[PDB]
Design a binder for this molecule. Structure first.
Ligand SMILES: NC(=O)c1ccc[n+]([C@@H]2O[C@H](COP(=O)([O-])OP(=O)(O)OC[C@H]3O[C@@H](n4cnc5c(N)ncnc54)[C@H](O)[C@@H]3O)[C@@H](O)[C@H]2O)c1
Length: 257
């Protein structure tokens, strides 16, 4: 591919799931991709598989890891055009009274402050390249979700932070956008479903939450990311929904008393 040829892209959480879909899409578009992930399994295999992708073991919650991620990307490839902040975690369902401030703080560290830290360290280089930031948020930041108060709050923060940073970096020509996936079939989805009483039913429910009648694929999030990096040159501060229409219309969510 040539749509994003000569460009260098960092994808956090890139070893599996949505992240690996985004890595593949960018490689297919002609870019060099640095896969950042805290687990070795998936990311190392992806580096062997894809000419054009390399793996760096990095925990975005560790500032030293992130500093090294950026410095190694520049040392090895000479530029930085796009950061995709995909690293994140969705805990299992929790009733509000079962959450804790400390668990909430830890989830903020992963889902919000890791995105903040890498973006900050990358922006001097993105300014030089007129590059861009893509944050992976979630539809539930916009419309809520039951049994996930901390998770929703973190994604509401990521989406808002995208718009604020877009304002700040617009004079420097650096675009900042987010993607808000709905239900995407991934290893996180399959694991969360396995903890449920009937996993088959939970997956069936997840497919029917979308008018399209299926869950989405990592490749579809990847295509949205490549669009935002390579062809969305008048888009900044937008929230690109990749949800199969989940937010549309009335549904089962629960005569006037
Ligand atoms: N799957 C969905 O339906 C869905 C929906 C909306 C938003 N999202 C978001 O998409 C992103 C990816 O989710 P997924 O479903 O592919 O998850 P996943 O668990 O299948 O993959 C996430 C990847 O990130 C890595 N990771 C986790 N913590 C990390 C850290 N501290 N540093 C670096 N890498 C780390 C994991 O090792 C893993 O490879 C997350 O931000 C998630 O909140 C997912």
């Amino acid at each position: 591919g040539t749509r994003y040829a000569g460009k260098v892209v960092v994808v956090t959480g890139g070893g599996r799931g949505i992240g690996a879909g985004i890595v593949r899409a960018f490689v297919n578009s002609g870019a060099r991709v640095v896969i950042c992930d805290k687990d070795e399994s998936g990311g190392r295999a992806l580096e062997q598989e894809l000419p054009g992708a390399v793996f760096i073991l990095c925990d975005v919650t560790q500032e030293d890891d992130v500093k090294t991620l950026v410095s190694e990307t520049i040392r090895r490839f000479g530029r930085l055009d796009c950061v995709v902040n995909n690293a994140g975690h969705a805990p299992p369902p929790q009733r509000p009274e079962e959450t804790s401030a400390q668990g909430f703080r830890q989830l903020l560290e992963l889902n919000l402050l890791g995105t903040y830290t890498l973006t900050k360290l990358a922006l001097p280089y993105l300014r030089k390249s007129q590059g861009n930031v893509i944050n992976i948020s979630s539809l539930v930041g916009a419309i809520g979700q039951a049994q996930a108060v901390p998770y929703v709050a973190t994604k509401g923060a990521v989406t808002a932070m995208t718009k604020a940073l877009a304002l700040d970096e617009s004079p420097y020509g650096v675009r900042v956008n987010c993607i808000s996936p709905g239900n995407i079939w991934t290893p996180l989805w399959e694991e969360l479903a396995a903890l449920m009483p009937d996993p088959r039913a939970s997956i069936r429910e997840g497919m029917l939450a979308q008018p399209l009648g299926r869950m989405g694929q990592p490749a579809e999030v990847g295509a949205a990311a490549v669009f935002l990096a390579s062809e969305a040159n008048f888009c900044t501060g937008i929230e690109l929904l990749v949800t199969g229409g989940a937010e549309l219309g009335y549904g089962c969510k629960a005569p006037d008393i």
